Amino acid sequence: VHWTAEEKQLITGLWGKVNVAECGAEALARLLIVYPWTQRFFASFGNLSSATAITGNPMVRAHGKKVLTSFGEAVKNLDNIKATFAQLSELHCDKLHVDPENFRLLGDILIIVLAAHFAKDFTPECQAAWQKLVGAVAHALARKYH
Amino acid sequence: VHWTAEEKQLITGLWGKVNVAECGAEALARLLIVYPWTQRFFASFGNLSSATAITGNPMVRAHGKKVLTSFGEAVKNLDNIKATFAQLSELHCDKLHVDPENFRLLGDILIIVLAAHFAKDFTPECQAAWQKLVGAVAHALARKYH
Amino acid sequence: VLSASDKTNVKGVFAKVGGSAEAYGAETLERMFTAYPQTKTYFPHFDLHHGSAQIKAHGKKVAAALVEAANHIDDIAGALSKLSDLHAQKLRVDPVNFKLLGHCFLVVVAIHHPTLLTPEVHASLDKFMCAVAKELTAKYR
Amino acid sequence: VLSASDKTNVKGVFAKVGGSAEAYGAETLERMFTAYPQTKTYFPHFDLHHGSAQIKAHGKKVAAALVEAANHIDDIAGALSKLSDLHAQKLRVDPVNFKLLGHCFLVVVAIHHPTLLTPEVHASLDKFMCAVAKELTAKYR
Numbered sequence: 416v417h418w419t420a421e422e423k424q425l426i427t428g429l430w431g432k433v434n435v436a437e438c439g440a441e442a443l444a445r446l447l448i449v450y451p452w453t454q455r456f457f458a459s460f461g462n463l464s465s466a467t468a469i470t471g472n473p474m475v476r477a478h479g480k481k482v483l484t485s486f487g488e489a490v491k492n493l494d495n496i497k498a499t500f501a502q503l504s505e506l507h508c509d510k511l512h513v514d515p516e517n518f519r520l521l522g523d524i525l526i527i528v529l530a531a532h533f534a535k536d537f538t539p540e541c542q543a544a545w546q547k548l549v550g551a552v553a554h555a556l557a558r559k560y561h
Numbered sequence: 562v563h564w565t566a567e568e569k570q571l572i573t574g575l576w577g578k579v580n581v582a583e584c585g586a587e588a589l590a591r592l593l594i595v596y597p598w599t600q601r602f603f604a605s606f607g608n609l610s611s612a613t614a615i616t617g618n619p620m621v622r623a624h625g626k627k628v629l630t631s632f633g634e635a636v637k638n639l640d641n642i643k644a645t646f647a648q649l650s651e652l653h654c655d656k657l658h659v660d661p662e663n664f665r666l667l668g669d670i671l672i673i674v675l676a677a678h679f680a681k682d683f684t685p686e687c688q689a690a691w692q693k694l695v696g697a698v699a700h701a702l703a704r705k706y707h
Numbered sequence: 708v709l710s711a712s713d714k715t716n717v718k719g720v721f722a723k724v725g726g727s728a729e730a731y732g733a734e735t736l737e738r739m740f741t742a743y744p745q746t747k748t749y750f751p752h753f754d755l756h757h758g759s760a761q762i763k764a765h766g767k768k769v770a771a772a773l774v775e776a777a778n779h780i781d782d783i784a785g786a787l788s789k790l791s792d793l794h795a796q797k798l799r800v801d802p803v804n805f806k807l808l809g810h811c812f813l814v815v816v817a818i819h820h821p822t823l824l825t826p827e828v829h830a831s832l833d834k835f836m837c838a839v840a841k842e843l844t845a846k847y848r
Numbered sequence: 849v850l851s852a853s854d855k856t857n858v859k860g861v862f863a864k865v866g867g868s869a870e871a872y873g874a875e876t877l878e879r880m881f882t883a884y885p886q887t888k889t890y891f892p893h894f895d896l897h898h899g900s901a902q903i904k905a906h907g908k909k910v911a912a913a914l915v916e917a918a919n920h921i922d923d924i925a926g927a928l929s930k931l932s933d934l935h936a937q938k939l940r941v942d943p944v945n946f947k948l949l950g951h952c953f954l955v956v957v958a959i960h961h962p963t964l965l966t967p968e969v970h971a972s973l974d975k976f977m978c979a980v981a982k983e984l985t986a987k988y989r
């Protein structure tokens with residue numbers, strides 16, 4: 416993915432005001448509830464019976480930070496995403512076997528948490544900048560399939 | 562994609578008895594009719610109002626051979642599919658802009674034409690061998706997106 | 708399909724949207740042409756410039772249609788009959804473009820109504836816009 | 849949804865399938881576990897060996913359920929009510945696995961009934977198995 420400067424600016428600058436603890440937890444929480452077949456993968460997180468139980472679940476709310484932290488790592492080495500996720504490819508492909516569609520779903524959702532959080536500051540071109548990043552990150556996980 | 566020998570055998574050997582003129586035409590015809598939003602892309606082929614008009618349309622029936630011929634080319638350089646389709650990537654990505662889902666659809670359909678054609682000789686492991694090939698070919702077209 | 712509680716949600720936002728649905732209609736459309744420029748192909752006849760009255764006009768019509776569907780929410784199918792044919796028989800819009808459109812509307816309602824877009828409502832409005840998406844493509848399947 | 853002519857087709861094959869639907873049920877299942885081995889995850893409790901009576905038994909049940917849905921084809925939803933919940937609330941099967949399953953059934957009916965699987969019927973049986981797929985996942989959307 417040939418990156419633009421304004422895109423890197425847009426990504427790094429909006430990444431600035433991101434509180435990964437919340438965003439990450441909310442992002443996962445939304446993945447868990449909107450696409451509830453994703454909860455299958457977090458049977459080890461315990462209580463996910465209710466939307467209410469999911470959205471304060473320490474493990475969700477803790478894991479959520481983990482995954483977003485990881486997004487951050489992409490924001491640093493934007494030109495080197497292929498390898499930032501290389502290993503978490505094997506994790507998600509060989510061990511866990513998550514269908515790559517989920518990576519967009521969880522990436523589409525991320526775009527919404529960002530949008531609710533930064534309101535008009537999330538302009539359509541910003542949205543587009545983040546759309547690529549997310550799309551890039553999901554290939555980078557997927558990379559170890561075909 | 563790390564290829565197996567039995568897979569190469571299976572692919573090349575079933576590719577043996579393929580009549581690309583028919584299979585190719587039938588394969589496209591089925592893409593045109595089962596997923597009719599694909600006909601948008603072949604407005605230059607003229608009469609595609611009816612299933613009957615589609616399934617003998619010289620351009621469909623001619624183009625169908627073209628595309629399958631191309632599949633053949635993959636069957637030759639199986640380890641070098643990345644570059645066999647490199648250019649037809651730009652064709653399908655920059656010029657035509659076809660959503661990559663279609664490449665699986667047209668690849669899923671291919672698997673069915675093959676199945677109707679070679680009957681029990683199309684064993685589940687053969688089906689699986691061809692499933693990868695098709696999956697490989699669609700990445701190779703897609704490659705020039707993200 | 709839609710739950711009786713889904714509909715509570717679906718309708719709620721659309722009221723909390725209200726007449727504002729002219730501007731949201733455009734904002735979503737523009738977000739589609741920016742974040743997904745391969746969508747621009749379908750409107751070669753349009754000036755796809757920011758603010759362009761074409762995308763603004765087309766905007767109203769789009770939301771307005773959603774507005775109308777979330778009112779006849781027990782019968783979305785018949786509420787969007789005339790559009791189902793246009794979008795499949797003339798236009799042949801790829802099913803996947805509908806995913807994108809809905810996505811940008813959710814982004815739009817999030818930006819403007821984040822203290823309404825709770826996961827439960829996130830779900831409902833997806834499920835709504837999935838079945839809005841489905842009936843517009845009924846001539847495929 | 850299903851057209852009145854779709855249904856003509858859908859039913860037709862299933863008769864031209866007939867009681868053979870025990871063996872087709874397995875053949876499709878095996879084709880799923882071979883061509884799509886990431887599906888094996890859902891049956892860790894099974895011996896997923898070729899011919900294994902488990903996959904054969906499970907086979908009948910699967911086709912049998914389709915058999916039953918293409919009979920109550922005006923009301924597939926209620927014909928597959930009890931399965932919708934199992935497949936979404938206990939099992940949580942990813943929506944995309946349903947795409948795969950249908951695909952292998954079409955491959956199965958093609959191999960065995962190719963002079964019936966004409967594009968028009970290809971369409972119809974997809975459209976059927978799409979709405980069989982949909983109602984089994986109703987607790988998602």
Ligand code: HEM
Pocket residue numbers: 453456457459481482485486503507511513517518519521522552553556
């Ligand atoms: C799209 C971007 C995604 C990113 C960046 C991502 C990243 C990560 C990271 C960094 C970890 C932690 C590894 C560790 O702690 O050692 C992880 C764990 C995991 N991810 Fe993902 N992930 C993504 C999507 C998904 C999706 C869509 C699913 C399932 C539907 C999934 C399922 C898991 C599971 C099951 C774990 C292990 C949970 C545990 O440690 O108990 N992930 N992911």
Ligand code: HEM
Pocket residue numbers: 599602603605627628631632649653657659663664665667668698699702
């Ligand atoms: C999945 C495997 C596919 C392969 C291997 C493939 C291959 C090709 C080849 C070899 C050509 C001919 C280029 C030439 O004659 O110079 C071509 C043309 C084309 N393909 Fe594809 N294609 C695939 C899928 C698709 C799909 C899914 C669509 C649309 C939905 C599409 C749309 C086109 C169009 C519009 C043309 C140009 C037609 C024309 O020349 O008038 N293709 N393709």
Ligand code: HEM
Pocket residue numbers: 746749750752768769770772773790798800804805808809839840
């Ligand atoms: C929920 C989804 C959608 C809704 C509610 C919607 C609504 C509408 C409405 C109400 C019209 C009629 C406007 C008129 O009278 O000219 C229309 C036309 C149209 N829509 Fe959509 N639409 C949707 C999705 C899509 C998507 C995904 C595309 C993708 C390109 C698309 C492209 C068009 C086009 C090209 C027209 C014709 C406008 C013209 O050329 O003048 N629509 N849509």
Ligand code: HEM
Pocket residue numbers: 887890891893909910911913914931939941945946949950980981
């Ligand atoms: C048209 C699609 C499908 C039909 C008609 C179907 C049919 C059935 C039926 C009738 C049962 C009940 C068997 C019993 O009483 O134990 C069942 C159970 C089950 N199905 Fe499906 N199914 C479909 C799709 C799927 C898919 C895609 C998966 C993917 C893994 C799946 C996995 C299962 C599992 C794990 C069970 C429970 C069986 C056990 O653990 O003993 N099904 N299915």
